[model samples]
Target: MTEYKLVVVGAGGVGKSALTIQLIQNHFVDEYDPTIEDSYRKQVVIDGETCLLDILDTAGEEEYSAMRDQYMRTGEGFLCVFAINNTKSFEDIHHYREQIKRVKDSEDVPMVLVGNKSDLPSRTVDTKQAQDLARSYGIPFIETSAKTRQGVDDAFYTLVREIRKHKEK
Candidate 1:
């Protein structure tokens, strides 16, 4: 089975933990505890192929901001997460992408631009805007609600597939 290392990143309280936990635990959490750094492991099948996912949930604060480069160097793919209710989080994704490219020293790094917390009533970042950003970056865009488990699985699946495809070239 192929193994993948993925890092989840976004602004604080943007549902990064919620989405990562939902992916591995299949449950919703209604809390907002900041994360320093957490790791999760799971085995999943994509396109009938078995694979292991090693996920790193990184803190999105100024204190831990420097650690992002370290994680970027080790991680094979990235989930550039942002909450749908926060436009600043959405705008900050390009910085994350640029950092990944700088650390990896490659432009074709695998990534998925995620608009999370779709279940929330206030949507400051719309789907079309997110899609346009993804299009500009030449990456996939997905919207997921960690609370409802909607498109949560698809996000990871798409990212892993992108990782595979990225290496094929």
Candidate 2:
């Protein structure tokens, strides 16, 4: 049996794909894919155990309302990524959480809030807001940068640790 099926999802260019790629390969890409009809799927190993990660790097903001529910149903955990500089990305997270609840019944499936682009100070999103929201969700939160290798491991590991915390009980 698979231990986890994680999903990284967010609006376009919010670093969902970047986080996934960095977690898997320890790399980042500046030239982001702009197509509005795409989603990527991959697997990653966190703490030496491989878990299937269904990466929904979404197309346009509009398409998100239709697709995220389906993704949440299959996801065992969520890495809700947002750009540190973009308040919109951070704000949209609540709506994403709402949709997740609509598709899934268990609050036990923890979602880790990620504040990406921590390397870019000028573009940093409010860390307090992220943490507060994560607190509301009763999940973990961390600010990360795929560029400077900032909280990248913490972002992924927080979710893994949360899962393990549940498994231990």
Candidate 3:
């Protein structure tokens, strides 16, 4: 089976681990541990082809800059996550995206813009605004609630497809 290296990136407190754990463990993590880094592997069938997903749940804290470039260089696709309730997290998306592009030295790298924490009661980022940003980046955008397990599969599955599409080019 083909292995796709997928990295999750975003600002601190954006639920990167929550989304990743939900996908890999089939459960929601409610606590905020401020992850330094974590890796997980899963075998699943996408579009009838079985493949392995090598997911890197990265630390959003800026202090981890040393390791960010290492994963950014290797990741085949990225999930750029941001919480809908936090505008600052949304704004930080540009930094992560740019870092990946620079590390890979390609403007057409596979990526997905993720608006996480949709289960929250209040949202600071509008869906249209998120969509507009995704449009500008020319990537897919999705709102996910790790607590509700909504859009969790789609987010990761979409990235796999994006990687496949990138490989075809």
Q: Of the pair 2 and 3, which is ahead by lDDT? A: 3
> Of the candidates shown, which would achieve the greatest lDDT relative to the real structure?
3
lDDT of 1 by residue, 27-129 (tens): 8988776643389888998888888899988777644355657765898999999999998899889777887788889999899999998888969898999
Give lDDT tens digits, candidate 3, residues 52-169: 9999888788554656687668899999999999999999999989988888899999999999999988699999999999999999999999999999999999999999998951
Global fold similarity of model 1 (TM-score): 0.92
Best candidate (score: TM-score): 3
Using all chains and alpha carbons, the TM-scores for the candidates as numbered come to: 0.92, 0.78, 0.94
In each prediction, how many residue pairs overlap at the backbone (N, C-alpha, C within less than 3 A)?
0, 3, 0
User: Where does candidate 3 stray beyond 4 Å?
Assistant: 34-37, 64-67
Ranking by lDDT: 3, 1, 2
* Candidate 3 TM-score to native: 0.94
* lDDT (Cα, 0-100) at 160 in candidate 2: 66
Ranking by TM-score: 3, 1, 2
How accurate locally is residue 115 in candidate 2, as Cα lDDT from 0 to 100? 87
RMSD in Å for all candidates:
2.0, 3.3, 1.7
Model 2 stretches with alpha carbons more than 4 Å out: 35-68, 167-169
